[PDB]
């Protein structure tokens, strides 16, 4: 009579997006989170025979493969498997009700879905559609799991925030519209991953690595700055902002990311630290990495990996103009929330990511992730960039005496507490300032604080 084929498929988009907590994006697309199943209605040309077989196929990226977990083939089943799976929940005439699930280890990104039918000793194959798959912070087994509901709403679902600024004397704040839900922004942030060096040099590997928030996170720390890769923002601290916008003139991420796209992925002029941190925050919250913005007053820039900010004098008092070490009035970066399978169970939670081009890391302006817990314990041999970030929050300022004749130098004074003050992020639910200094280091003036500093100096 006729072979089994698909008439139409209802993705039940509204319903699934609500369940997957993606209902807030301004988009007509099916946006999903990994690990969580979704339900679809598939209207066939007939009932299922008990000799016929349906096979689902999903792929993401340009060189998808089973081995790399970027393509999957799975039968319509009654058995719930481990990986990708499709469960037949009911048949009603020609209509099948199907529950499809993704692994909690699946690469995030855009996927294509196809169905392959074996019937009447023949094989057919049709494209069903496409969807977006994000990280899933509601899912206890996802690496980005954040169990507390209030915290999740803040650090994922909140599209407006507050960055602290100024100096120790005079702390202020500015509003920032993260704007992750506005039109095209989720899409642009996905674009970013497809334009990294990582991807340009080995797309197949890059896309397989998108299952991992450590990887996605660090790529973003590179790609949000123009350096190296034609990323989103170009920094300028000259004071003269000719040929572009004054950094103090941006109010959020949306203009920036759009202007980047519209110029054909050409850098946007110009940004400073808070502008990098705010734009990176949009990207992180978009993709499902809970994140927030951190400000640090008296932030050290150490330029020689010794955990100290060095000033230099002749033994007579005259100041020798040597060293590059400096200290900012304030600096701003991001923390993202994930477990660290590369490090150990004791190192999960908040991870520093910094898109402001200060120092290079494996030749590139990138920075993090760095276990905040790690930084506090002085465990600075760990990945990534932990000496730089230790210096930022807990450098000692040292004045040195240098004898030109003999080339001897020695310590003169040490100031062990001027660096890293009033470290700050927006409150959950309100616009109050949380202090998180004690999360980054032991209490200034204490014993432990000095014994870490020592530990850390020996870990270099």
């Amino acid at each position: 009579m006729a072979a089994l084929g698909v008439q139409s498929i209802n993705w039940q988009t509204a319903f699934n997006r609500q369940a997957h907590h993606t209902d807030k994006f301004s988009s007509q697309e099916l946006i999903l989170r990994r690990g969580q199943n979704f339900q679809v209605l598939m209207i066939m040309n007939k009932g299922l025979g008990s000799n016929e077989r349906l096979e689902f196929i999903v792929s993401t990226g340009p060189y998808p493969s089973e081995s790399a977990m970027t393509k999957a083939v799975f039968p319509l089943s009654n058995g719930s498997s481990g990986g990708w799976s499709a469960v037949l929940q009911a048949s009603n005439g020609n209509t099948l009700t199907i529950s499809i699930s993704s692994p909690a280890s699946a690469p995030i990104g855009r996927y294509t879905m196809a169905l392959q039918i074996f019937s009447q000793g023949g094989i057919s194959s049709v494209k069903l559609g496409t969807f977006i798959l994000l990280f899933n912070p509601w899912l206890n087994v996802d690496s980005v799991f954040m169990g507390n509901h209030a915290e999740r709403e803040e650090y994922v679902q909140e599209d407006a925030g507050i960055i602290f600024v100024g100096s120790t004397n005079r702390i202020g704040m500015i509003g920032w519209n993260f704007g992750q839900f506005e039109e095209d922004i989720l899409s642009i942030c996905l674009s970013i991953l497809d334009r990294s060096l990582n991807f340009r040099r080995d797309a197949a590997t890059d896309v397989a690595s998108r299952n991992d928030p450590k990887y996605v996170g660090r790529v973003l720390s590179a790609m949000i700055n123009s350096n190296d890769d034609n990323g989103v923002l170009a920094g300028n601290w000259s004071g003269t902002y000719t040929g572009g916008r004054d950094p103090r003139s941006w109010n959020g991420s949306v203009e920036i990311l759009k202007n980047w796209k519209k110029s054909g992925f050409s850098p946007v002029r110009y940004g400073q630290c808070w502008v990098f941190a705010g734009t990176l925050n949009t990207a992180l919250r978009s993709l499902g990495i809970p994140s927030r913005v951190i400000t640090n007053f008296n932030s050290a820039h150490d330029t020689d990996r010794n955990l100290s900010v060095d000033v230099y004098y002749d033994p007579m008092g005259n100041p020798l103009d040597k060293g590059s070490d400096s200290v900012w009035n304030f600096h701003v970066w991001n923390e993202g929330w994930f477990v660290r399978s590369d490090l150990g169970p004791s190192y999960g939670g908040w991870q520093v990511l910094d898109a402001t081009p200060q120092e290079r890391s494996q030749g590139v302006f990138q920075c993090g992730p760095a276990s905040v817990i790690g930084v506090r314990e002085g465990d600075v041999q760990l990945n990534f960039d932990m000496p730089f970030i230790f210096a930022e929050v807990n450098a000692d300022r040292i004045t040195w005496l240098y004898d030109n004749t003999t080339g001897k130098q020695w310590k003169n004074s040490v100031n062990s507490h001027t660096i890293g003050r009033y470290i700050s992020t927006k409150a959950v639910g309100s616009n109050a300032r949380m202090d998180v200094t004690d999360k980054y280091k032991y209490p200034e003036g204490s014993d432990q604080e000095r014994q870490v500093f020592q530990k850390a100096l020996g870990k270099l």
């Binding site: 808070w274 200290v327 009035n329 600096h331």
Partner: peptide, 4 residues
């Protein structure tokens, strides 16, 4: 954002 300014150097001390």
């Amino acid at each position: 954002x300014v150097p001390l």
